[PDB]
Amino acid sequence: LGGYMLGSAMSRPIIHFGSDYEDRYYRENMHRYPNQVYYRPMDEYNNQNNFVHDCVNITIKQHTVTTTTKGENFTETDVKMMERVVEQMCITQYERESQAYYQR
């Protein structure tokens, strides 16, 4: 990892995709899927899009590299479903820190 941290735990979003089968498929198969995302503190770096692109590229990776040793099943369809959720949790998470910093 180096300097990444985890955020703070919450629910996961419910995300429709063009059929509620894909939403429900994901929601019934959350479990493995991350709930908090990994990202870094400012140190000048602050972004929305490039915190989120990072988080969707670090959280996902540190859920594939580990996965390659436990015989897991994450197809591209699973990775896409994961990224979709990780994005939204990350955007949501970034709003908790954004409001919390702006409120200080």
Tab-separated table of C-alpha atoms in Angstrom:
chain	number	residue	atom	x	y	z
A	1	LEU	CA	0.000	0.000	0.000
A	2	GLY	CA	2.368	2.641	1.326
A	3	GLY	CA	0.452	5.675	2.619
A	4	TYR	CA	-3.132	4.671	1.629
A	5	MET	CA	-5.761	4.624	4.380
A	6	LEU	CA	-9.222	3.053	4.460
A	7	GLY	CA	-12.197	5.433	4.849
A	8	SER	CA	-15.031	4.833	7.354
A	9	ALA	CA	-17.575	2.043	7.058
A	10	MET	CA	-21.163	2.694	5.920
A	11	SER	CA	-23.661	0.768	3.734
A	12	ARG	CA	-23.022	0.188	0.029
A	13	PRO	CA	-25.150	2.026	-2.583
A	14	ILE	CA	-27.873	0.255	-4.586
A	15	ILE	CA	-27.002	0.791	-8.291
A	16	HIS	CA	-29.278	-0.025	-11.216
A	17	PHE	CA	-27.608	-0.716	-14.589
A	18	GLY	CA	-30.427	-1.237	-17.165
A	19	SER	CA	-32.095	-4.296	-15.542
A	20	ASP	CA	-32.880	-4.760	-11.806
A	21	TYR	CA	-31.492	-8.300	-12.192
A	22	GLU	CA	-27.977	-6.743	-12.379
A	23	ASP	CA	-28.659	-4.527	-9.315
A	24	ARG	CA	-30.060	-7.453	-7.327
A	25	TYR	CA	-27.335	-9.812	-8.650
A	26	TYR	CA	-24.789	-7.396	-7.122
A	27	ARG	CA	-26.763	-6.685	-3.911
A	28	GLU	CA	-27.285	-10.363	-3.053
A	29	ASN	CA	-23.553	-10.926	-3.837
A	30	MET	CA	-22.052	-7.906	-1.996
A	31	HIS	CA	-20.207	-9.736	0.888
A	32	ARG	CA	-16.685	-9.998	-0.718
A	33	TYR	CA	-17.159	-6.591	-2.411
A	34	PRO	CA	-15.522	-3.679	-0.562
A	35	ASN	CA	-17.572	-1.316	1.619
A	36	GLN	CA	-14.884	1.313	2.317
A	37	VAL	CA	-12.396	2.476	-0.293
A	38	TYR	CA	-8.645	3.039	-0.026
A	39	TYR	CA	-7.240	6.464	-0.959
A	40	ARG	CA	-4.690	9.028	0.412
A	41	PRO	CA	-4.847	12.272	2.450
A	42	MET	CA	-4.259	15.664	0.717
A	43	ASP	CA	-0.534	16.516	0.918
A	44	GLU	CA	-1.554	18.874	-2.034
A	45	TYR	CA	-3.097	16.022	-4.122
A	46	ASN	CA	-6.811	16.939	-3.395
A	47	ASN	CA	-9.255	16.033	-6.132
A	48	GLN	CA	-12.693	14.550	-6.616
A	49	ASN	CA	-12.048	12.838	-9.948
A	50	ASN	CA	-8.422	11.878	-9.241
A	51	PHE	CA	-9.159	10.749	-5.656
A	52	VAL	CA	-11.935	8.588	-7.135
A	53	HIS	CA	-9.924	7.317	-10.164
A	54	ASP	CA	-7.158	6.390	-7.677
A	55	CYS	CA	-9.589	4.761	-5.229
A	56	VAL	CA	-11.268	2.756	-8.063
A	57	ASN	CA	-7.694	1.688	-9.134
A	58	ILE	CA	-6.219	0.937	-5.675
A	59	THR	CA	-9.236	-0.592	-3.872
A	60	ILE	CA	-10.007	-2.790	-6.896
A	61	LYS	CA	-6.334	-3.792	-7.352
A	62	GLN	CA	-5.873	-4.622	-3.669
A	63	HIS	CA	-9.008	-6.808	-4.167
A	64	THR	CA	-7.501	-8.562	-7.284
A	65	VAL	CA	-3.864	-9.130	-6.111
A	66	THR	CA	-5.115	-10.749	-2.898
A	67	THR	CA	-7.827	-12.490	-4.977
A	68	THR	CA	-5.265	-14.225	-7.251
A	69	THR	CA	-4.179	-16.319	-4.157
A	70	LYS	CA	-7.593	-17.369	-2.727
A	71	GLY	CA	-8.947	-18.764	-6.031
A	72	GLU	CA	-11.630	-16.050	-6.213
A	73	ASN	CA	-13.982	-15.426	-9.223
A	74	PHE	CA	-13.908	-11.754	-10.362
A	75	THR	CA	-14.595	-11.588	-14.132
A	76	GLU	CA	-14.542	-8.237	-15.979
A	77	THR	CA	-18.326	-8.164	-15.340
A	78	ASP	CA	-17.632	-8.464	-11.584
A	79	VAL	CA	-14.787	-5.906	-11.742
A	80	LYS	CA	-17.157	-3.496	-13.568
A	81	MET	CA	-19.913	-4.087	-10.960
A	82	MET	CA	-17.261	-3.526	-8.245
A	83	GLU	CA	-15.842	-0.324	-9.811
A	84	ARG	CA	-19.430	1.046	-10.236
A	85	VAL	CA	-20.080	0.597	-6.489
A	86	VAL	CA	-16.536	1.653	-5.399
A	87	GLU	CA	-16.923	4.931	-7.401
A	88	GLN	CA	-20.201	5.817	-5.692
A	89	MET	CA	-18.948	4.883	-2.194
A	90	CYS	CA	-15.800	6.958	-2.963
A	91	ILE	CA	-17.784	10.028	-4.208
A	92	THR	CA	-20.062	9.639	-1.162
A	93	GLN	CA	-16.989	9.242	1.137
A	94	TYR	CA	-15.288	12.265	-0.381
A	95	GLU	CA	-18.447	14.264	0.460
A	96	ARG	CA	-18.184	13.221	4.157
A	97	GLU	CA	-14.580	14.438	4.306
A	98	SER	CA	-15.372	17.500	2.125
A	99	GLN	CA	-18.267	18.626	4.371
A	100	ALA	CA	-16.286	17.670	7.505
A	101	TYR	CA	-13.272	19.768	6.399
A	102	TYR	CA	-15.412	22.705	5.227
A	103	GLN	CA	-17.340	22.570	8.561
A	104	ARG	CA	-14.123	22.769	10.666
